[PDB]
Each structure stands twice: as structure tokens, then as C-alpha cells.
Amino acid sequence: RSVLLVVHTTETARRVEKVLGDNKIALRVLSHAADGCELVLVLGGDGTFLRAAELARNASIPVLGVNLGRIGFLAEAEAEAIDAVLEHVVAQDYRVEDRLTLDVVVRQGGRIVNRGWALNEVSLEKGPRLGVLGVVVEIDGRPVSAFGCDGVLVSTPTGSTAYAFSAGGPVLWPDLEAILVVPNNAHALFGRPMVTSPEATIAIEIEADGHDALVFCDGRREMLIPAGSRLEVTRCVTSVKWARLDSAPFTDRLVRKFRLPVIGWRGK
Amino acid sequence: RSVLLVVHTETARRVEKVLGDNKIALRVLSHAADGCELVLVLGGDGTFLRAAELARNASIPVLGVNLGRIGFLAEAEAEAIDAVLEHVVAQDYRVEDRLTLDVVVRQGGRIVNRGWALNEVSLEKGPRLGVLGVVVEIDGRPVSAFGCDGVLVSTPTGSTAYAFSAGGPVLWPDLEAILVVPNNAHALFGRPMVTSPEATIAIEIEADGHDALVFCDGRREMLIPAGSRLEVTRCVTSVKWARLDSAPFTDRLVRKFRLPVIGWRGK
Amino acid sequence: RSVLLVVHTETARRVEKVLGDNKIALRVLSHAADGCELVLVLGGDGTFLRAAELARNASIPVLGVNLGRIGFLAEAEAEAIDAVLEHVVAQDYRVEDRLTLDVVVRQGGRIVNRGWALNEVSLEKGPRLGVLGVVVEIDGRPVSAFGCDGVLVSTPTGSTAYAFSAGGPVLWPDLEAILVVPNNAHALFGRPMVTSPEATIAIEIEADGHDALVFCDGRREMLIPAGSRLEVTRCVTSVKWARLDSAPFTDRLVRKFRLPVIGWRGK
Amino acid sequence: RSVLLVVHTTETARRVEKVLGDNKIALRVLSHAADGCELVLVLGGDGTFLRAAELARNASIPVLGVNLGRIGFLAEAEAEAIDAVLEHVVAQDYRVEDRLTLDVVVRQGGRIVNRGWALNEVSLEKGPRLGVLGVVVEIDGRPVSAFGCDGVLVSTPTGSTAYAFSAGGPVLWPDLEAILVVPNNAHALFGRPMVTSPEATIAIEIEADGHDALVFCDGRREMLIPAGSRLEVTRCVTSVKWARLDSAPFTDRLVRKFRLPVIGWRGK
């Protein structure tokens, strides 16, 4: 019964990790394959959740988040319930569910030059602080737009709230399976975001007569993209496991975090 | 074997003749025309929609051929008549169900009205002046309250319609989701939300206000009494679509908006 | 000395009493009420507008005091009544002309109608269905043609109004420009343009279509015959505004939308 | 009668420069105070115009552009009139007019740490390819918004078409005098552009508990902005002179460059 605790920097940790021992439940701690475990409890923020998930993916085991600082769409519950959750942690009665996670592939000269993945988003951005990245977006073999820009986002629904949102993207509930593509500061009449199927295949072609570009997956992982190659993203067959439980629905998390006037509502 | 041909109000007499040779009963329109097996149509998306209405009624597939302008609803252009006519007579075309919406109007907890949309449920303000106060709600929880010209509630297919003019995001025809788009809202957060098909969009209309109008697919109108709440969900009864090797959505989009694609490689 | 007090339909009886002591003729409304020197008003921007209508007619300054909600048009709140009343009686407040619009409807080259707006000239589609085909033109040259729910044409002051709901850019009250904002356009390029005050916005309405409506400042309506062209420019006769030490626009904006400003230093 | 010719890389140059000699008109050439001159003829693109202007400003003398490659909003005329323009160049009957140009000032500890200017735009952008730049925007002493972002644009009307546009900004005709402020990928409900007076004073305060940021003026000139300082922009009292002539109005240039459906227009 080994669990892999992960905390941001975060003092209610020892509490949990002690209460976990009392139920003869092994425990490791972190801030790097931490295998063998059963679950991956994480206390912190969404940027923390992501890190923790980067571990669970590998080990092929559930993730579970507990918010500390600010609010996070990725958190399952607050710190005012560390015991309740904990209780479920041991009881192992939380429902696990696979979550749409992306699979990124750079391909040059028809050959796979690199490989990555994203449980949240895939951001392609220009290299030089100056100028614009010439690019071509193509969905399912056919190309939609040819424009210069700061980059292009490709995110899961869960990442629509993140940089996608900032970029101009629309909100998408977490339980929906699709793919968001948001041009980033395009210099074109048409530059609206696009939503596709979980099976669609999104590919972006980096201009060949230009500098290089970078790719950031979930803000953490990076990878240089050599001019004239092509970023192809699709639904990874290997999804991130998530521990679920009676939690605040995404609709409330959105109102909280953004402070949306919900006054006047009656209900059904 | 009967085929109901629906048109706006020329390559038609060619569909009707060729169809006859293969001895096929052909009726014409511009009303539950039952019996038939397919519902061919020559026109625009507007025309297509009326047709689909009838097809919806009969419980039989629809199929169209753009005559004038471009439409994201048609399966083939006007120069592939026989080509299609050939599939029409052969009946080798695919029939895939398409997600349709079930619009319900409830007042005092009683279904005051009912409806269905294939493209969009556009809720609008009645008077040419003022603003409509509304409260959007996703699955039992509200997400906003604001005044606006209304609130669109379309289908991945309707996303290129009014929802798109309302400044919504291009969705893809095969995608199965619901797109909610605030119509000229007076708020900070008035951007489009997209949900699962099991999602339940509800739109509560301000009691202390006027009466509203709900337009389904741009034709079927109905009256919304102040203080009544509009409920939209996945209609269990979908509209059958006749599918055949045609330009994929991506091309229609580019062809339609004149999106530049110069410099594309391929792989 | 006369002052026309205009209200929606309480701190009023206080303005009217205090005003009387200083022996000042006070009439009340909710119609050219001439003679007076100033036009005080207690209400919202809506109320303010009607008032400004009258003030416009008389050729005399307007001045308001928000009673209920917040408004970017008022100069003071309801707890600065005397404070204002004091400036009202003292007549030490500034009077600066505000840019106003001159809406002209021309058909066959003949001024079929005429109008003026202080906040916005919102051109709209008549039927609850369909789309209005229009051709926007800046100073004799066109910039677009598309179908849409209409085309707003506001003032820096109107930018926080409907133009803002149409998704336009926040302009500043003291700025002297014209903001054109396409209303739910079905185009790629349907974003707001802003021009000089000498600019001449003209909006040609599709001949082969229905008739449209033009709403000035949200009250004064008029009918636009298909194929007629709407001309909007700087009205030579501006509406006088009573200016007095008040919260600058920047604060109204933040107060109104609840814009966060935490962490600001100062210099 | 000394003129300072400037060409991008551009073969119709020697032509002009010879025809200019024939009228006893001195001529210098470029691709750095090139003073003493009378006018500054430039053949090329908008990125070229900007460079050329960077010279004229200094010398306090008119600018005039002739497009070569693509189209440019900054160009007065095409190459199919090199003589016509030339003709006016010598005849000196072109009208000169001052153009609203900005004045940028970084100020730390209440002290002016740097100084710049922009005839087109002022782009403040985050440093790290990752994370978001915490910032505070303030117009005329009062602060409007407090958000994280990729930066914030501050441009003249003439620069509304450039990066401002790409950023989300609206179009503004060249002859209008105002100031455009366009948040760049803000993560806030309110992030719409803002238009102010030519006298308004725009200031942006860079968070102190964060990395540094950069500022680019007209895409050329740069300058690092030390955390916790404040970028204040205002209308420079010294404007760029522009040579004017019967040219295509801004309305047409916009339709050309973007290909806008102008069909159905009747006219007055």
C-alpha cells in the first residue's frame, strides 16, 4: 500500500502522511520514476498538479489534488477537507477515470525527430522576441489557415481555462472530449479558435524559410522545433488517471476563480 | 419506391427524369410527405433546413445539392447530379444519425411548449429596444446573469451559422458537443462555452421583464413568457443524414471564407 | 431663474426645496421646456438621455445625479446633492460642448429623414429573422459588405453602451472620434473601426431586401427603406454638458465593471 | 538641395538617384545621423519606412515612402509612379504634416532610467518564454486593470494595423489622433483594447516580485525593463514629418492588404 505524496514547497503534509501511516499505508514524499505506488496525492496548485501528474502518467497510477494557495480548476477538493479526502484515500472508494491527454510529435523529413505529450495544452511559440512565426494549420490532412503569428495552442478541454483562455479561447467543460486549437496573435482576418473531435489529427507546419520555434507541454516540458518541420498532435492512447469524488462541479469552480455574477438565478 | 424532391421555388428536371427511368416515385415541394425513403433537395442551407424538417417528421434520411451559393450542409455540388443520382438509385450511401436539440419551455414547472433544432436554438429579446435579462445554467448550476440580445444554443453543425456571427468558435460537424454563445451580452465574461452532449443547458428569463422569442433552425418560432425557463438538451430522435464521398468540412470552410492556404506542404 | 428637474417617475424634494430657498423657479418632468438655464436630472443613463433630449432642444446645459445604479453619464452620486445644488445655485460649474451625431437618411439622393444621437446610432434589421445586407463606407470609400443584425455608430461616450455589448472597445469620454461597430456580422473582418470627427460614415442598405430601423440614443426610432443609405457625421450643434469635480471616467469604469486594481503603486 | 535616399536591400534606385541629379539635387544613399539633407526618400516596405523614419526624426526632416515588395499602409505610392512622385520630390509641392508620435519613459525609484519613442507602437513583453507578466495599467493617474499577460501594446493609430491588430486591437484611421492600448494575452475577464486622448498619459507598472521585461519600439529599438519599474508613455512634443500627396486613402489600403469584400457598394 505505497502512496507517493507530493507537496509544493505546505505544512498539513506531515498530518496526512502520519494519518496514512496509521492505516499501515506506505508513503514517499516529493516537491524521477517514483514507481511501485498505488495513488499520487498532491497538495498545492495547478502548476503543482501538472508536475505530480507528470509522475503518475509514467507509473500508470491515479492522481488526486488538494488545493493550498489560490483556486485551481485541477483540484478535487480544498484543504478544509484533508481528512474527508484522506478518508477516501484509504477507503479506496474514489472513482478513477481516464482523461483525454494529447500526444505531440515533431516530424522532419518525414521522420519523427521528437516526441512529447500534454494533459493540458501544447503551446508552439516563435523563437525570436521579434518578428512573426509563419505557419500552416491543418486538420485531418486538409489545411485551414496560412498565417503569421506568436504561435498556436492545442489544448485539452481541461486546458481551455489556462493559456488557451488567455489566448482568446472559449471555455470547455472538463468532461467533454474534444480538441481546442487557438491561433495565438495571428495576423489574419480569420483567427478564431476551433474545436475538433478526439480523433481528429491536428498538425501545424513551421515555415522553412524562417527561424526555429519552441513547444511547451503543460508549461513544463520543452522542445525546440527546427524550421520547416511539422508538429502533429493527436489523442494519446495512454490517458492520465484521475481520482474523482463528490466535488464542486466545474461550473462552480469557474464562477469562483473568475468571480462571475450569478445573481438572479432561480433553479429547477 | 418514392423520393420527395424539395427545391427553393433547373438541374432538377434532370434529377426527376433520370430518377423516373429507374422507375422511382417522385413528389415535389418547395406537410408530412411520408412513404418515401429518402428526401433529396436542391438549394441552400436554408432550403436544406426546411427539407430536414420533413425528413425529421417522416423518420427518413435527407440529402442535398447546393444550387446557388456554398453551404456547409450540402453533400455535393450541382455538377455531380448523376453521380449522386447514381448513389440515390443505388442506395449505397451511408446513413449516420446527427445530433439534434430538444428545446423545452417550462413555466411554473410545466412544459408550456416544446421544440427541436438541428442547427441552433436562438433565444432573442422581443422589443426592438431594451435588453433581455437572463441567467445561463449548465447542469443545475448557473454561470452568468446578464442583459443581452439573447443567447444562441447551437450544434457543432450550427456553429458556422448565427453562432458564428455572434462571434462563436468554428466547431467540426462530426464533433459531439453543445455550443452556448451569448448574443451581444453586456458583461465582461460573455464568451462561448462548449459542453458534453449529456450537458443540460437551461436559460432562465427575467421575471420582471418582457416576453422573448425562441427561433429554432431559423424557421420554427415560439413565444417565451417572462419568468419562464428555456431547457435545451440532446434530442433522443436524431435527423438522419445521407453521407457520401464529399468535400470534407475543412474544405467547405476554406472554400466558403476564402481562407488562404498558400505554402502548405502535406507531411 | 428657472431649472427644469427631470426624474424617472426622493432626494428630489430636497433639491426642489433647497433650490426654492434660493428663490429658483423649478418645473418637474419624467415637451420643449424652454426658458430655464440648466436641466438637472435624478436617475440613470436612460433617464439622463431623455433629459439631454430636452436640453438639446432648449440649447441649455444638462447635469445629472445617479439615483439607483451606476452610470457613466452622471456627474455626481446621490450623497452630493447639496454639494451639487450648491454649484447649481452658484453657477460656477463648467460648460463644455460634447460631440453629437447627425443621422441623415437619404433615398434616391433625397433626405428622406433626419436625426441626431448623443450616445449611438444603432442601425438594425427589421424582421426577427434573416439578416441585413449592408455596405459600410468611410469618407466615400467602402470597407466591407456583409450581412448582420445591424451596425452601431456611437460616440466615445456611447462606447460603454450597446457598442460595448456588441463587443466594441472602451473609448474615453474626452476623446473626439467616431466608433463604428458591426452588429453580429457574418464576415471574417467585422471588427470596430474608429475615425476622425470629420469622418463621414455612410451605411448603404441592401435594395433587394427588407426595411430597417435606426434607433438614436435608444429612444428616437425611425424607418429605413431598403436601398436607402444612412449618413452619420458630426452634428454642428452639440449638447452642453455641466462639468464639475467628479470621479474621472477611469474610476466609473472600474467601479462599474468591478475591474480589479489590487497592487497598484502610484508612480 | 541634399536628399537622403534609402532602399531596402531595389533596382529602380539608381534611376531615381540619377533623375535627381539631373535637377542638380544632391543625393546620399543607405540601406547614423545623415543630417543636412532636405527630404528622405525611401523605397521598400513598412519595416523599411520605419528605419528611414528613425533617421528623419533625428534630422527633423520629411519622410516619403515608395512600396516595392508587398503592400504597406505606410507607403505613399507604388513603384508604378516613381517618376510622378519624383516629379513632386523636385517640385517640392508635396504637403508636409506632423504625425502623432509617442514618447516612452521607463522610471524606477521615481527616476527616469531610460527613454525612447515610437511612430508606430510600443510593445512591452514578458522576458521568460514561460510564465506570465504581472502588471498594472493606469490611465491619467487612475489605474484600470491589474492582470497577468504576455505584455501590453501602446500604439499610434498608424500602428493599429500592425501588432496591435494581431493582438486584438481595432482599426483606426491614420488621420485620427488618439492612443491605442491593447492588452496582450491577458488572463482577465476584461481585456478589451482602449482608446484615449492624445494628451492622456498611459503608464504601465511592471510587477516587482517578478522577472524583467522588454520594450520594443517600432519593432527595432529595444530596452530592458527592470522588475518593479514603470513604463509611462505620452504624446511626444516632437512629431515625425510626413510627405503627403494625392494617394490612395487609408480605406482602400485596408481593403487591398486584407482583401475585404467591397461588393455591392453603390456610392454617393
Chain D residues lying within 8 Å of A47, measured CB to CB: none
Closest residue by Cα to residue D260 from B162, C123, C193, C198: C193
Closest residue by Cα to residue D26 from D41, D12, D11: D41
Structure-determination technique = X-ray
Closest residue by Cα to residue C24 from C36, C12, C32, C9: C36
Interaxial angle between packed helices B81-90 and B12-21, expressed in degrees from 0 to 180 and rounded to the nearest 10: 40
Structural domains in chain B, CATH included, are 1-99+237-267 (3.40.50.10330), 100-236 (2.60.200.30)
CB nearest to C165's CB, from B148, B164, B215:
B148
What dihedral do alpha carbons C54, C57, C58, C60 form, nearest 10°?
Answer: 80
Dihedral pair phi/psi, residue D47, rounded to 5°:
-70, -20
What dihedral do alpha carbons C175, C176, C182, C187 form, nearest 10°?
Answer: -90
Q: How many CB atoms lie within 10 A of CB C260?
A: 18
What dihedral do alpha carbons C182, C229, C155, C125 form, nearest 10°?
Answer: -50
Question: Cell numbers at residue A72, please?
Answer: 485551481
CA distances from A110 to A207, A228, C50, C154 (A): 15, 11, 69, 54
Residue D105 identity (one-letter amino acid): V
Q: How many CB atoms lie within 10 A of CB C35?
A: 13
Whether C45 is a known active-site residue: answer yes
Chain A residues lying within 8 Å of D187, measured CB to CB: 165-166
Rounded to a whole number, what is the largest CA-CA distance in chain B? 63
Q: Taking CA atoms, what residue in D is nearest to A217?
A: D130
Cβ-contact C77, C65 below 8 angstroms = yes
- Which residues of B sit within 8 Å Cβ distance of C? 124, 128-129, 131, 147-149, 162, 164-167, 183-186, 188, 213, 215, 218-219, 221, 257
Q: Taking CA atoms, what residue in D is nearest to B189?
A: D189
Chains that touch D (3 or more CB pairs under 8 A): A, B, C
Q: Taking CA atoms, what residue in D is nearest to C261?
A: D146
Closest residue by Cα to residue C39 from C22, C18, C53, C21: C53
Q: H or E stretch including C2?
A: strand C2-7
Interaxial angle between packed helices D82-91 and D13-21, expressed in degrees from 0 to 180 and rounded to the nearest 10: 30
Question: Cell numbers at residue B91, please?
Answer: 442506395
Start-to-end C-alpha separation, chain C: 46
- Active-site position among B21, B45, B97, B217: B45
Q: H or E stretch including A48?
A: helix A46-59
Question: Cell numbers at residue A179, please?
Answer: 480538441
Q: H or E stretch including A233?
A: strand A230-235
Residue A186 identity (one-letter amino acid): A
Cβ-contact C154, C161 below 8 angstroms = yes
Alpha-carbon gap, residue A121 to D183, rounded angstroms? 22
Alpha-carbon gap, residue A229 to A42, rounded angstroms? 37
Chains that touch C (3 or more CB pairs under 8 A): A, B, D
Question: Cell numbers at residue B4, please?
Answer: 420527395
Closest residue by Cα to residue D137 from D201, D55, D65, D226: D201
Chain A residues lying within 8 Å of D71, measured CB to CB: none
What dihedral do alpha carbons D124, D129, D130, D131 form, nearest 10°?
Answer: -10
Q: H or E stretch including A83?
A: helix A82-91
User: A187 and D168: CB-CB below 8 Å?
Assistant: no
The helix, strand and coil proportions of chain A, stated in percent and rounded to the nearest 5, come to 20, 40, 40
Alpha-carbon gap, residue C256 to B93, rounded angstroms? 57
Chain B residues lying within 8 Å of A262, measured CB to CB: 135, 142-145
Closest residue by Cα to residue B72 from B152, B6, B161: B161
**Those residues with Cβ within 8 angstroms of residue A107's Cβ, 6 or more apart along the chain or in another chain:** A113, A229, A230, A232, B267
The residues facing C222 across adjacent strands are: C214
The residues facing A171 across adjacent strands are: B193
- Resolution of the determined structure in angstroms stands at 2.8
The residues facing B27 across adjacent strands are: B4
Counting every residue written for chain A, the total comes to: 268
**Those residues with Cβ within 8 angstroms of residue B187's Cβ, 6 or more apart along the chain or in another chain:** A261, B144, B146, B148
- Chain C nearest CA to B66, separation (Å): 19
Q: H or E stretch including A243?
A: strand A240-244
Residue A42 identity (one-letter amino acid): V
CA angle A192, A194, A200 (to 5 degrees): 155
Counting every residue written for chain C, the total comes to: 267
- SS3 letters across chain B: CEEEEEECCCCHHHHHHHHHHCCCEEEEECCCCCCCCEEEEEECHHHHHHHHHHHHHHCCCEEEEECCCCCCCCCECCCCHHHHHHHHHHCCCEEEEEEEEEEEEEECCEEEEEEEECCEEEEEECCCCCCEEEEEEECCEEEEEEEECEEEEECCCHHHCHHHHCCCCEECCCCCCEEEEEECCCCCCCCCEEECCCCCEEEEECCCCCCEEEEECCCEEEEECCCCEEEEEEEEEEEEEEECCCCCHHHHHHHHHCCCCCCCCCC
Start-to-end C-alpha separation, chain A: 44
User: B218 and C129: CB-CB below 8 Å?
Assistant: yes
The residues facing A142 across adjacent strands are: A139
Alpha-carbon gap, residue D183 to C140, rounded angstroms? 32
DSSP state of C256: H
- Chain A nearest CA to B145, separation (Å): 5
Estimate to the nearest angstrom the gap between the alpha carbon of B216 and the chain centroid. Answer: 8
